[model samples]
Target: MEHVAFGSEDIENTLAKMDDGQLDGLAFGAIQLDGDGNILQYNAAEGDIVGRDPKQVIGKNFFKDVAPCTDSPEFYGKFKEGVASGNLNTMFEYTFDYQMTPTKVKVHMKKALSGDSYWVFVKRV
Candidate 1:
């Protein structure tokens, strides 16, 4: 199957059927997190984007464990909101500049069609 691109309109549906390997093939980062914010599936693209290893990132909390910078109400807050409402499809631009170079990326946060997980899609700008 062809890999899905970032910011696809029906990304939640497409991702529901994708496997870990396919997600890794994507050009952008794809991270699957549970409702409680624990990482369930992390792709290599995401690891490469952050210069980390997927093995060390999987199962960690995206907001708190992996990236505390996103633990705030703006980032993690929107995630919690989606989980509570059961409809999470939002897109916004975020800047990452704590450790790495000042970079800007577009973030697409969506609730998976499966209803139990959330997806974070990031593409460098």
Candidate 2:
């Protein structure tokens, strides 16, 4: 598959077109990371979902800010196991409270071409 780069301008335009409701609907987040797990890109939707803006998130580690739940050695162990054997796709359903309503989300992870970075796309169901 061809990788599409979402530029800064593209991110700005995309966010500009969205109403608050639309932002709440898609529940998107974009993050770029270096090989060492440092954050590069943290967009508005992601910030909103995780309750932090770009300034707070960018340059900070992703595992520390957004999903601290997965910082465990056991979790990293499984992640390493998958990567080592070429398992590039994984999914799990989890629940969270959004605006006082119970929401279920599907989390997905894939390895990017950089080999050191990964992209995580999440969807709310």
Candidate 3:
């Protein structure tokens, strides 16, 4: 089996199947979502990196409720396009304002190959 630095062989599985230890253990922020962009699991590193608690999220809409900044065409649009098409697996450099400071980072989206979930992975650049 093959694996990435922070995740296991099958990242799609690694997202939802693992405990917070595996997720928080990751170097990046992992936000698991439903097809409609509902937050399922927001990991530890993500909570710290995004400077928000999972309690503030977890059951809210990721694009709207959690971070309205991404509701525009840049972030959420791309995410919706991928989820709707059911074949979104790509990454790009993006700048998100963390604490009102523009921070550069890489945003990754991975829609399930043949399932009903999506994952947004963010890491500082």
Candidate 4:
């Protein structure tokens, strides 16, 4: 209902109310994944930031396929743990070492309070 920033504490709540256009309007990369780690929703910025076509990536495995670099403990580990705990509000600085440019970004992971999907917010640093 309000302007939601990348590091917003209650982003999950705000995200649930946002439309696809709203998500795409975000300055940061906003991606949503199913519990099984499949990409469910991917915004325009994410496609540009990651150099992946959103149409091709939707329904693909985020960790195993789209971005293998996030499969590590600090990234996917926290995702699994958050899914299990049912409370995933986390933020960290990370480098996309596997990318062509090796980009650095601030990552925020959060699970929706009302759905089986998870959200990942990335802002280039």
Candidate 5:
């Protein structure tokens, strides 16, 4: 696969055009979270990365349920800060280790236009 640089791209515009068949075609996970951290949009790319079923993760809390490893000041904290600010565009590296092997991942936190949602892009680095 090509090295698709994704963490710095325009996520809102990207997501606006996504269809069911489109999500898995991307090189990274496209996770769209609601204001209260419930899963709204999820993709198979992330499911493969996390070793979980995407269907079972719907409406689950990201920090508390799906990726509990992110329940920390660094990850969840940033999530809260992003939604509260109405705009968040930041990039950072994260590691997940709950279901399978430890995975170093790149994260792009982008708040949606409504200021009440977020689109989290992920790529296993």
Candidate 6:
């Protein structure tokens, strides 16, 4: 895979430059999930991150498709509780293997205005 590093300023610029094509190479996925954990928006970055096509991702359950690690009752239970309690900023970190390579991931979840939906931004390190 091609690797490029961007400084803080460049990071801002790069984020601004994100178009459909630019999103395809990202190592992270930006996903939006519904109250029941159904996927709403699975961006190209997400497809690349999970090695799956967008067509195979969207409309599928978020917890089931790309990250079954988060499917535990404790995780989803807390998520639902947070949504009901109106907790806006919730973040978590977990470690898993990537193609047999150990990797750590940070996932941030935020409640949006569109009914019990949440935005998930994931990064791998």
Every model: Cα RMSD to truth: 1.5, 8.1, 3.1, 1.9, 2.2, 5.4
lDDT (10s digit) by residue, model 2, range 19-112: 4445434445555555445776555656655566777766887666555665655444445555676554565665545333555666555555
Write one digit per residue (lDDT tens) for candidate 5, span 20-74: 6677677888888997799988888889888988789988998888888888989
lDDT, candidate 1, 44-74, per-residue tens = 8777777768899888887777787788898
**Among these predicted structures, which one has the highest TM-score?**
1
Model 3 ranges off by over 4 Å: 1-3, 6-10, 98-100
lDDT of 5: 0.81
**Which structure is stronger by lDDT: 1 or 5?**
1
Ranking by lDDT: 4, 1, 5, 3, 6, 2
For all candidates in order, the CA lDDT equals 0.84, 0.53, 0.76, 0.85, 0.81, 0.62
lDDT of 3 by residue, 1-125 (tens): 11344333467755555666677677788888888889977878777766889877999998778787788888888988888887777778887774546778788888753467788888888
Ranking by TM-score: 1, 4, 5, 3, 6, 2
What is residue 99's positional error in candidate 5, in angstroms? 1.3
Candidate with top lDDT is 4
Worst 10 residues of 4 by lDDT: 1-10
Task: State candidate 3's TM-score.
Answer: 0.83
Better model by lDDT, 3 or 6?
A: 3
Better of 2 and 6 by TM-score: 6
Q: Candidate 4, residues 28-108: lDDT per residue as tens digits?
A: 898998887999899998888878888999989999998898898989999998888787888899998665588989988
Tens-digit lDDT string for candidate 6 (44-79): 765655566777767988677666766776466667
Q: 2 or 5: which has the higher lDDT?
A: 5
Runs of candidate 2 exceeding 4 Å displacement: 1-27, 73-78, 82-87, 96-103
Q: CA shift at 125, candidate 3, in angstroms?
A: 0.8
Q: With candidate 5 superimposed using the best TM-score fit, by how many Å does residue 27's alpha carbon deviate from the native?
A: 1.1
